[PDB]
């Protein structure tokens, strides 16, 4: 029962800066829950995020690892993935892109 992390190719969201938001990734596992992290792309490198709240949720027999934005801000714009190391193999999801739209500020 291999660990799998699913994000559909070309996954994307547009959200207004100042609003609450979360990104989710479904984690498939059968033994102990793997240690999953979120990372954010900087060029070709997916940089581990450690300063942003993460949580786990169970929904319809599926586990989700969640990244929280409280609220989303313009700097949160970019591409994100979930990642885990399972038996000496780096397993990362496809990128999801968060496009942050600036709020009315006239």
């Amino acid at each position: 029962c291999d660990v799998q992390l699913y994000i559909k190719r070309q996954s994307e969201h547009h959200i207004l800066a100042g609003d609450p938001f979360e990104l989710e990734c479904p984690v498939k596992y059968c033994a102990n829950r793997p240690h999953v992290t979120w990372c954010k792309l900087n060029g070709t490198t997916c940089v581990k995020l450690e300063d942003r709240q993460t949580s786990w949720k169970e929904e319809k027999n599926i586990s989700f690892f969640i990244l929280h934005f409280e609220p989303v801000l313009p700097n949160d714009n970019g591409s994100y993935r979930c990642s885990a190391n399972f038996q000496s193999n780096l397993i990362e999801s496809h990128s999801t892109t968060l496009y942050v739209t600036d709020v009315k500020s006239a």
Partner: antibody
Amino acid sequence: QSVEESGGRLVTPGTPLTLTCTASGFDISKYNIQWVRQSPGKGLEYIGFINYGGSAYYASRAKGRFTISKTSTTVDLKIASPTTGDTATYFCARGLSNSDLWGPGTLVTVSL
Amino acid sequence: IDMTQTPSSVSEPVGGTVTIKCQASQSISSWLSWYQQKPGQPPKLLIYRASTLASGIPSRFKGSGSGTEYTLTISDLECADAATYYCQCTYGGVVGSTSDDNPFGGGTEVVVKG
């Protein structure tokens, strides 16, 4: 987290009135916050919102009639000169494009 | 921007499907949310950004559309789905949009036939 409201009461036409929106479990001052009202038996009507930095914007019919403001702990809606038509339940909510947490509503009655 | 929500009321049997439409007067590029409101309760967010399901909302609720045309579909209708439903344009909050309004549609009363 949750959103609470207060201030709904009976006032005579033209008497200024302030409603207050507060939060439990989040900092209300750092999100976009919207105000929406509902006359008894009628639909929802958007009034305006205050952005996460503290600048407010209004539906054209609300501009000049309502002011939305915030402090570090509250978001306020002030009705400058209420008319009987302003009789309604007033709701505040966290977020605009993702407006996820709503207050229970506070009931304003404008009547002689 | 004006929002045209139809129908104003609909009745469907338990297990059936409800279809609600909202038309914007100009493209709002998927800046649209759907809410459920039961009597005496606040609006409850179902869908935001046209198709994104709010947390805790069952997948029986589906939002779709783009441009000027938006649809809320409620499948496998339950008695618990009896409520009034509203769209809201959220484009007024987007930087540079001309109107500052974020208008609601007129609502759709859903009667569930048991």
